[PDB]
Amino acid sequence: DCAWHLGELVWCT
Amino acid sequence: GPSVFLFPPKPKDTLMISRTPEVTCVVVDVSHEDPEVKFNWYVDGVEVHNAKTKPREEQYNSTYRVVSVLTVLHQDWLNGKEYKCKVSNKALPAPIEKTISKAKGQPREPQVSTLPPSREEMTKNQVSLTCLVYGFYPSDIAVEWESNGQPENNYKTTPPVLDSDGSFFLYSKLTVDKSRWQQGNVFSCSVMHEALHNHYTQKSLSLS
Amino acid sequence: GPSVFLFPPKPKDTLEASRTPEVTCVVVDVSHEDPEVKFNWYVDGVEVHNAKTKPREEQYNSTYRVVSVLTVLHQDWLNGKEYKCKVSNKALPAPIEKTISKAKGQPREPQVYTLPPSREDMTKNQVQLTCLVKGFYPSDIAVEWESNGQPENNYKTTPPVLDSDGSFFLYSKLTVDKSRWQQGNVFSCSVMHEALHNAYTQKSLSL
Numbered sequence: 264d265c266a267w268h269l270g271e272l273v274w275c276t
Numbered sequence: 277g278p279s280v281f282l283f284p285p286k287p288k289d290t291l292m293i294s295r296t297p298e299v300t301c302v303v304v305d306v307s308h309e310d311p312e313v314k315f316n317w318y319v320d321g322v323e324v325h326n327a328k329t330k331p332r333e334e335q336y337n338s339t340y341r342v343v344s345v346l347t348v349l350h351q352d353w354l355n356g357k358e359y360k361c362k363v364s365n366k367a368l369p370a371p372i373e374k375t376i377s378k379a380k381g382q383p384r385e386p387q388v389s390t391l392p393p394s395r396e397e398m399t400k401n402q403v404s405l406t407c408l409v410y411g412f413y414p415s416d417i418a419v420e421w422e423s424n425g426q427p428e429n430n431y432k433t434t435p436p437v438l439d440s441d442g443s444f445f446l447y448s449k450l451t452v453d454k455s456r457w458q459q460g461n462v463f464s465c466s467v468m469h470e471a472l473h474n475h476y477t478q479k480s481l482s483l484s
Numbered sequence: 485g486p487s488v489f490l491f492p493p494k495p496k497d498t499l500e501a502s503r504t505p506e507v508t509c510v511v512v513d514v515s516h517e518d519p520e521v522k523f524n525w526y527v528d529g530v531e532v533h534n535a536k537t538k539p540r541e542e543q544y545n546s547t548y549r550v551v552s553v554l555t556v557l558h559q560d561w562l563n564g565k566e567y568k569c570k571v572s573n574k575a576l577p578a579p580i581e582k583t584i585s586k587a588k589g590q591p592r593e594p595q596v597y598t599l600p601p602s603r604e605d606m607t608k609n610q611v612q613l614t615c616l617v618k619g620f621y622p623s624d625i626a627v628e629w630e631s632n633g634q635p636e637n638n639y640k641t642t643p644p645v646l647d648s649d650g651s652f653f654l655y656s657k658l659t660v661d662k663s664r665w666q667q668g669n670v671f672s673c674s675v676m677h678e679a680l681h682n683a684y685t686q687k688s689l690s691l
């Protein structure tokens with residue numbers, strides 16, 4: 264899975 | 277003589293894979309007669325070569341400000357690597373060295389919880405939404421607020437405070453018109469930190 | 485030569501009738517050859533003579549630390565009187581002067597709100613109790629916790645933070661064992677500020 268912050272990619276495992 | 281200041285990346289830049297974290301070696305009081313500065317860079321003692329010198333800037337006090345920027349990999353900074361800048365200049369009997377790195381110590385996951393306005397605050401034109409973040413180490417962090425995908429900028433965050441178990445805590449307070457709270461809008465506290473799953477967590481908060 | 489630092493009284497000292505607030509003029513880097521420091525104190529420009537000098541203290545880095553303490557009245561400090569310390573020493577080209585007083589600006593009264601721990605927080609051994617203190621000016625404040633008349637010392641308080649309306653806020657966090665919280669004990673957040681009624685308020689928090 265991935266995390267997004269205000270549409271901008273944070274990190275994926 | 278010249279003096280050197282070495283600055284770490286912004287936490288956000290080390291935490292967002294879509295950003296570019298960099299370390300910055302600032303040299304002040306560079307003389308008009310000897311403006312030439314040599315930079316050597318080291319990563320855990322191993323010399324690297326991909327630094328770039330920013331445009332020279334003359335200062336109001338007749339000295340130059342010379343700056344070298346080294347790009348760094350997210351995981352090297354997060355893995356605790358040590359970055360050394362070495363500065364040489366003729367007005368400097370010996371070269372100056374500085375090292376910075378992430379604070380040492382096992383990382384701990386922030387505990388993020390939101391807290392609604394006190395009942396007693398409900399009399400005011402404006403209400404405080406609280407985000408408490410605790411048990412995190414190291415202290416490098418970003419906290420922001422949003423609602424409906426749009427940033428909510430009317431907040432303030434306390435600096436991190438060292439706790440008695442050796443972790444850090446902070447609080448973030450977003451202030452909103454009481455009417456926006458009553459109207460049932462959902463507000464979200466966003467935390468970014470190395471020790472969270474994917475560096476990111478979000479906690480929401482609305483009228484019950 | 486020497487360097488001078490002038491320190492205000494502790495907020496709690498100016499806010500409790502029983503305590504004694506003082507202004508403190510610390511002189512570091514005093515040499516061994518000319519250790520004599522002369523102090524002149526002025527209150528709104530008017531020289532006073534009741535200051536008292538601390539024992540001289542050897543620092544072991546070639547210097548003395550010399551301190552002059554001036555006792556001040558609660559009302560004087562709170563009414564914004566300015567306190568000037570003037571330090572003269574043979575190793576100074578000219579005397580050094582410093583001035584200190586309460587931050588200027590209309591005092592505003594703290595709003596004190598206790599916030600229970602989140603239900604998502606309840607799987608740990610200890611819970612976090614929050615006291616939000618906002619809307620206060622100046623930033624001089626003291627915050628404490630107690631329960632059933634007894635002081636509760638296991639807390640941390642953030643430094644005052646300047647808020648968007650020009651007032652200050654802080655949070656204080658008391659950590660207690662989950663059981664004590666669950667058993668319905670009352671915990672209290674005590675706040676001292678010049679702009680509170682009687683320079684004091686208390687707010688309590690319980691399951």
Ligand SMILES: *[C@@H]1O[C@H](CO[C@@H]2O[C@@H](C)[C@@H](O)[C@@H](O)[C@@H]2O)[C@@H](O[C@@H]2O[C@H](CO)[C@@H](O[C@@H]3O[C@H](CO[C@H]4O[C@H](CO)[C@@H](O)[C@H](O)[C@@H]4O[C@@H]4O[C@H](CO)[C@@H](O[C@@H]5O[C@H](CO)[C@H](O)[C@H](O)[C@H]5O)[C@H](O)[C@H]4NC(C)=O)[C@@H](O)[C@H](O[C@H]4O[C@H](CO)[C@@H](O)[C@H](O)[C@@H]4O)[C@@H]3O)[C@H](O)[C@H]2NC(C)=O)[C@H](O)[C@H]1NC(C)=O
Nearest residue numbers: 281283284285286297298299300302304305335336337339
């Ligand atoms: C001649 O003039 C120059 C320039 O003076 C400037 O202009 C004049 C008119 C005045 O207004 C000055 O106040 C101006 O600065 C003088 O140069 C100054 O010398 C100082 C020391 O003599 C030096 O002080 C040290 O500052 C450190 C923090 O500096 C920060 O913050 C200040 C403002 O708060 C800012 O001005 C500085 O540039 C610096 O800002 C950071 O820059 C870095 C690097 O670019 C940024 O990091 C990067 O950011 C990007 C994003 O763009 C990206 O995220 C990258 O990944 C990231 O790396 C960073 O974001 C900036 N931060 C901020 C907040 O802006 C102090 O920490 C340091 O303290 C340390 O040392 C002290 C003892 O010396 C100790 O007390 C302490 O414990 C610390 O160890 C120093 O106080 C000034 O920075 C410096 N000014 C500049 C502009 O460089 C010069 O002295 C004078 N000479 C003579 C002979 O008179």
Ligand SMILES: *[C@@H]1O[C@H](CO[C@@H]2O[C@@H](C)[C@@H](O)[C@@H](O)[C@@H]2O)[C@@H](O[C@@H]2O[C@H](CO)[C@@H](O[C@@H]3O[C@H](CO[C@H]4O[C@H](CO)[C@@H](O)[C@H](O)[C@@H]4O[C@@H]4O[C@H](CO)[C@@H](O[C@@H]5O[C@H](CO)[C@H](O)[C@H](O)[C@H]5O)[C@H](O)[C@H]4NC(C)=O)[C@@H](O)[C@H](O[C@H]4O[C@H](CO)[C@@H](O)[C@H](O)[C@@H]4O)[C@@H]3O)[C@H](O)[C@H]2NC(C)=O)[C@H](O)[C@H]1NC(C)=O
Nearest residue numbers: 487489491492493494505506507508512513543545547549
């Ligand atoms: C030789 O050594 C001496 C002594 O130093 C000690 O011994 C050496 C050998 C080392 O081991 C040191 O680590 C030891 O400290 C050196 O003296 C030092 O000089 C420094 C600079 O010259 C000076 O820095 C300035 O400090 C200010 C803050 O001082 C506070 O906090 C520090 C620590 O954070 C503390 O050490 C000080 O004592 C002082 O503490 C406050 O004291 C006041 C007065 O007692 C207290 O207030 C009173 O409290 C009583 C009850 O207790 C009562 O309630 C009264 O009503 C009340 O008034 C107060 O509680 C104390 N606060 C704290 C937190 O403890 C800084 O503000 C200042 O910065 C400012 O100026 C700078 C520019 O000049 C700016 O950069 C900055 O932003 C600010 O504007 C300075 O940094 C050190 O204080 C001083 N140390 C001591 C102990 O005096 C000496 O330098 C050295 N000489 C040589 C040649 O090497």
